[PDB]
Each structure stands twice: as C-alpha cells, then as structure tokens.
Design a binder for this molecule. Sequence first.
Ligand SMILES: O=c1[nH]cnc2c1ncn2[C@@H]1O[C@H](COP(=O)(O)OP(=O)(O)OP(=O)(O)O)[C@@H](O)[C@H]1O
Ligand SMILES: [Ca+2]
Length: 426
Amino acid sequence: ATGQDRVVALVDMDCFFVQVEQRQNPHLRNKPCAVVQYKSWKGGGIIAVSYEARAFGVTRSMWADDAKKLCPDLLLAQVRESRGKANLTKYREASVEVMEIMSRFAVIERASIDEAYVDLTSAVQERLQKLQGQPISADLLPSTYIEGLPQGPTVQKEGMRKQGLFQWLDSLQIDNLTSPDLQLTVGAVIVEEMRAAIERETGFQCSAGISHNKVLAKLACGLNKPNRQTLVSHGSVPQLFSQMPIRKIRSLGGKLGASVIEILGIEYMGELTQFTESQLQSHFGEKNGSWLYAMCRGIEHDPVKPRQLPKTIGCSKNFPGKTALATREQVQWWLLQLAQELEERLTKDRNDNDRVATQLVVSIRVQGDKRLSSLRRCCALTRYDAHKMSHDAFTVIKNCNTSGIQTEWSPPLTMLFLCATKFSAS
DNA sequence: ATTCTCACACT
DNA sequence: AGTGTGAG
Ligand SMILES: O=c1[nH]cnc2c1ncn2[C@@H]1O[C@H](COP(=O)(O)OP(=O)(O)OP(=O)(O)O)[C@@H](O)[C@H]1O
Ligand SMILES: [Ca+2]
C-alpha cells in the first residue's frame, strides 16, 4: 500500500475575514488591514490579518493597540456585534457562497468557516477520459507549484515555479491513465479551474494543496500562500518530511506531537520511519501508533466526508477578569442573550437545511478553573424558543452555585456555553 | 481577555 | 453522559 489511491485537495481562503471586508469596502483593498472584535479592551482582538499587515509582524490574537505599534498605518474593520457578542453571520454567509461553487466540481467536506477538503478522485477520472491522451500544457497550471522541483543540474519566484512545473510536465507519463502522478496533475488542473471560478464569482482568492490525502493536502496548501496552489506528490514526501517539524502535521500540533518528540528523541516527521509499527503502538497506543507508522511514509486514510454542514450549532461567550458573572440575574440575562442568538441560527437552519436539533448542551466555566470547560450538562430541546432554552439552561446549572445566597452566584462564572446537538431530518 | 467555534476519542 | 484533545 503506497497511499496513492485518492486525489484530495485542501482549499484555504487567504485571510478570509479580511477579504470579506475588503470586497465590501474598497478603501481597505491592497492595504495592511485586520479584522477585530470588542473595540473597548486594548482596541479589540485581531482575528484576521491581511498579508500586507503580516509583513509588519501583525498576527492573530494580538490586541489592535499592540498591532498599531508594529504597523502604524494599519486599517481595521470591526466585526458586527449582536446582543453583546461578536456576530460572524457575514463571514458564514460568504463561506456558503464559496462552498456552493466548490460543490460544482467535486464533493467537499467543510473543515471550518474558511477551509474545505475536496475529493477529486472521480472528477479526475472523468477528466482523464475526456483528455484522449494529449499533453497537459503548463498553461493549464498558471499558479501551481510542484513541491521539490526544480532540482538538479533563476533568481525570481515566478521563474522557479515555471522551471519546476516544466520539469514535472516534461517527465509526465500521459499514456498511462493510472499513474498517481498523472492523477495528481489532473487534480491540480481541476483545482485551478475551481479557484478561477471562486474568484470570478465571489472576488475571493484562495490557496490550495493537492496530494493523495487530507494531511499532505493541508501541509501542501501552506507551502506557497497566498493565491497559489501546491502539488505534493508521493515521491516528494521523503525529502519534504526529512526536515519537517513534527508539530506541523495535522493532529500533531499539541500534546501528542510533543510526546512523540520527547519520548522518541526526534524532531522531524521523516525520523519516524526508523521505528517498527509495534514500537510506535507501545508508546502511543494502537490507533496513534499505526497512524504514525503510515503517516511518516505519506500514507493516511481519513476520508473526505460528504458533509458541507456542521453537526452542532453553539453559542459561547467568555467573561474574563473582573467581568466574571457574580449574580443570579446576570447569569440569567447572558444565558438569554446566548439562547436568543442560538434561536436565530436554529430557525434559519430548520428553514434552509430541513433539520431540527433535539438536545441542548450547557457548559459553564468557573473562575479559578484551569480548562476550556468546567462542566457540561444536557437537556431536551423541544422548541426553538429562547426563553425556554435559557430557562432550561439555568435549571441544569443552577445547583453549581456554591453560594448559599439565592441572589448571588459564587464562584463567579468566566464562560457560558449553549450548544444545539443531535439533529433529526425535518 | 485569542475569542469563538466544531469535530472526535475515550470512558 | 461527561471529559479531554486538536483544529481553524
Ligand atoms: O485561534 C485561531 N487560529 C486559527 N483560526 C481561528 C482561530 N480562532 C478562530 N479561527 C477561525 O478560523 C478562521 C480562519 O483561520 P485560518 O487559520 O485558516 O487563517 P486566516 O483565514 O485568518 O488566514 P490564513 O492564515 O488562512 O491565510 C478565522 O478567521 C476564524 O474564522
Ligand atoms: Ca484561510
């Protein structure tokens, strides 16, 4: 098994929220700019950064006040606020624009508001029979980089790309309709076309990775951003992984990746090949060990899920610092604010996508606790009604109130969370 | 006060 | 059901 059965792409909308604001406000185009939320504390938290601003060092999670110190001409657009919380509807709606276009070309799995995996295997097959057996021109791949090329016996970026692509296409074996390299290349032609259609029909630019699975496709996508696409072939994996830090591979950016590094005493993905599968399973469990043994040879089997819609709809807000909720009627009021936004989105979801959610999940965070959530409770969701929803949410959390007073809430709450789950066809 | 989401494994 | 990890 060489993990070359599929053609999979990962498409990533370049700094998506910024692009949405730049389409809407021409003044912001081709300028260093960022999208922020909650203007009051330190000028707002930055949640998306244009490439012009990233060259000054502006990143996500900065405060806008701090970003302006790195980039004094930074322009800002602020997220819509509804009922005291950031409202992402404009970006969600723009996402649906893009996903609907992508769905014309192949079946897609929505990964987040601005990424989608694409399964191109069948689309490639049909495009290879329509193509008689004729060469693929470099003109069909005007923004494609071939990872690892050029090599062997130019000083500008576009010169290198064309040389890499020339060497790739020159050695391509077009007469064999089953070569995985040829299948990737056709896959890349289809993604150029999909990316052309997205930009024509929305104005949005994006990057893409093309490879044989989601993990390599995702890694590839990040190699030549913005507005470019990268093909990572099976043959390119040993050189690519030989200096690729473990933490860059999807699902290894956290504790598991750190302990792969610490327990095995290695730094790069390719060093994993020297261990037997049993060795890896004993250190990291059957599932992780098998997965690691295959992944470091470029092999991964997670399917592109034919799923363009989320499985839960949730509304959370944080109350950090002295803003932690400390009274009963504070908790009730914010639960109602979250329940009302939830109600808006559930009804819109029942009209568009013909489904009703049946379970309500409530999560709270307590001041002093260490973790994302302190506590998770559920109850039935039988009516899309904000006052019943918030009333029910309070009911299943009210006994977490350590305080003996009826009107006070101790310990103060640093996070409220409502989530609709367990959908049924409607 | 990276916030705000969403998916999945484990038990 | 409830907790913990990982991601965009
Ligand atoms: O903490 C986060 N880390 C990454 N992402 C986050 C985070 N919190 C929320 N998000 C959501 O994930 C969208 C795109 O996150 P992304 O990583 O794909 O990066 P961008 O499009 O900003 O620019 P790129 O770097 O892709 O050119 C963001 O806007 C927002 O909706
Ligand atoms: Ca993106």
